[PDB]
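Structural prep section.
Before we set up the soaks we want a predicted structure of the protein with ERZ in place, mainly to decide which crystallisation condition to try first. Input record follows.
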Amino acid sequence: GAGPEMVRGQVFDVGPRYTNLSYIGEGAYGMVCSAYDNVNKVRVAIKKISPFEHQTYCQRTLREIKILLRFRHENIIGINDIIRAPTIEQMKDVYIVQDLMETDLYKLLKTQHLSNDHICYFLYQILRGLKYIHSANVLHRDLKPSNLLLNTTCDLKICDFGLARVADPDHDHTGFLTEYVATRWYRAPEIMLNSKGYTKSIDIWSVGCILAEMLSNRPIFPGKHYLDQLNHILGILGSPSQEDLNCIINLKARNYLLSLPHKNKVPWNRLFPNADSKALDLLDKMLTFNPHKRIEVEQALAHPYLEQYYDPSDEPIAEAPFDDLPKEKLKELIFEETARFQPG
Ligand SMILES: Cc1cnc(Nc2cnn(C)c2C)nc1
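Run finished without errors. Recording the C-alpha cells verbatim:
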C-alpha cells in the first residue's frame, strides 16, 4: 500500500504517475511544485487548484482550462495532464500538469541584467505568442513579467489566462475611475479614464511596460494606487495632446486631464541611455497614450528592431476565433472540461 504525498503540510496528491515532488511557489488559491513524470520520464510542473468555494475562482479556473486546451503554440504554455477525482462528489482539488520551466521573467529581472540580444528575443517571442492569442479574438489582459515563463535556453511561454476575455471593442466604453481587476503597473492609461479593457490595445500597452522593464530591471510606472498609476504614465509621456483628449468624450475623464498642470515628455533615450535606438522607437509605439494610435501586434513584429526574427510564415494564427453561473454549474463545467485526461 501507500499514502498521498505532502509538501509543506498540504496534500499534493498527484501519484502514482508523478513522484519526487519539490515545492516551487504558490499563489492565492494554489501551491505549485515540480514532480517526476513516471510515464514521460521528465520532471514537470504541477499547480494545485482548489476553486470550488468562490465562484470567481471557478470562473477563472474554467476560463483558463478552456483557453489553454484550445490553444496550441510554442510561446503559450499548454496543459499536458489534469488530475482530479473520478466523480464530482469526490472532486475537491484539480491538478494542472504543464511543461517545467526554469524560471519566469519577474525572477529573472530581479537577479539578472539582460543583454540587448536577450531583450530582443524575449520581446519577439512575447509578440509571436500574442499574435496567436489576438488572432483567436482573445485578450490576455494580465501580461506582466511573472506570467512569462523561461526555460534554460531562454525560450518563452505565456501563462495565466485567468483574466482573459473575448475581445469586444464596441462595448469598451465606461466612465471615469471604473474599478479594474488586472495588475496595476501594466494597466493602460485608458483603463483609469474610459475603458473596460475589451480591446487588443490593452495587451500591447502591457507588452510596452514589459519592454521598458527589460531595459532597466525596474517597472516603468510603479503606481501605488488606482489614480497614481495614471500620474506615473503622464509623468513620462507628458500631457495628452488636444487630439488625444478629443477622443475622450466622457467629461469626468477629460476634465480631470485638463485640470492637471502641463507635463513634458521625458525622452526615452534619457530614461534608457544604454538601449538600442530601434528598441526605443518600438517602445514609443507600444506606449502611445491614444489606444487607436497604438501599434498592433502584427505591426510590432514587422518593426525594424525585430528584423532578425521576423518571419510571418513562422508566426502562426489560431484556426478559428475563441457569466451568471453558480458554483455548482461551474464545478460541473470544470469536471466536464477535464474528462479527456481521465483513465477511461
Ligand atoms: C507552469 C510552470 C510554473 N513554474 C515553472 N517553473 C518555475 C518558475 N519559477 N521557478 C523557480 C520554477 C522552477 N514551470 C512551469
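Observations: Residues 24, 32, 45, 77, 98, 100-101, 103-104, 107, 149, 159 surround ERZ (CB under 6 Å).
Flagged for discussion at group meeting.
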